[PDB]
Amino acid sequence: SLTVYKYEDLQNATNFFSEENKIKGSVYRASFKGDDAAVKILKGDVSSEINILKRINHANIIRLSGFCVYKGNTYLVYEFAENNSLDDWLHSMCLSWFQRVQIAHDVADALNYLHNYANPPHVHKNLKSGNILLDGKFRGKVSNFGLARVMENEGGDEGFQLTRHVIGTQGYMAPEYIENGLITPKMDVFAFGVVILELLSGREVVGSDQLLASTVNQVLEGDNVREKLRGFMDPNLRDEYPLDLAFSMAEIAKRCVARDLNSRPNVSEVFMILSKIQS
Ligand SMILES: Nc1ncnc2c1ncn2[C@@H]1O[C@H](COP(=O)(O)OP(=O)(O)NP(=O)(O)O)[C@@H](O)[C@H]1O
Secondary structure (H helix, E strand, O other), rough: OOOOHHHHHHHHHOOOOOOOOOOOOEEEEOOOOOEEEEEEEEEOOOHHHHHHOOOOOOOOOOEEEEEEEOOEEEEEEEEOOOEEEHHHHHOOOOHHHHHHHHHHHHHHHHHHHHHHHOOOOOOOOOOOOOOOEEEOOOOEEEEEOOOOOOOOOOOOOOOOOOOHHHHHHHHHHOHHHHHHHHHHHHHHHHHHHHHHHHHOOOOOOOOOOEEEHHHHHHHHHOOOOOHHHHHHHOOHOOOOOHHHHHHHHHHHHHHHOOOOOOOOOOHHHHHHHHHHHOO
């Protein structure tokens, strides 16, 4: 039943939605009850979707405190994630090697829960650096896994950024989806592969137009792999990383970004890999 909220308490926490808003028009910061939160405004009663998706709770998934339906709109209150999104940090203090490995581990931990032990399993479909939030200890918190996906919303929209949805599509989406709409948990594995590549290189998923998911193959192929990998590594790490474990992590990302979905590993395997190379 989560926690039923009175719309009043939401107005006061958000200063009556007084450009206390985070970037997203529907995303506001609510300061109240000591622990801060984030309020997302959604059109129409989406209560039915919550009663299904509310099954998904995990330490590394953005937690839903509750919801409120007021005058034809649904206001959802999530745990506030200070330090914003991984994209902000990778494309802007800099995340150390330890932190980058921790974040990859939390995401693999959440993807492992979603694909196997969520009752029933659920495919994310929208795993991106911008959706992976961080908390005060820079731990991962997956977010836009439902109802915020482009065509998952029952109430369609025309306040839509086409060029932006398409940029993320080419950089994160697996080929079997772009070509046939084939939706399997392997598409999350492909996306998760690109995230790791972002964590290792800090590069844009689509650079200035080469995709970050095709460069890892050239970096690990042929000869002089050590030198090509050093150059691939994020400069901001400044040698403060074990090149051995970086190559290993880059290897598990290449398998994740393979074109054949059945060749890709299950996230459960990636979760076991990241846990053994962790501190
Ligand atoms: N629970 C939360 N805690 C803190 N910040 C949040 C939370 N949910 C969303 N945000 C912020 O709200 C913005 C994104 O809102 P969102 O509804 O996810 O749309 P979005 O634009 O698709 N996400 P993004 O990929 O980062 O641009 C980002 O600046 C996030 O940091």
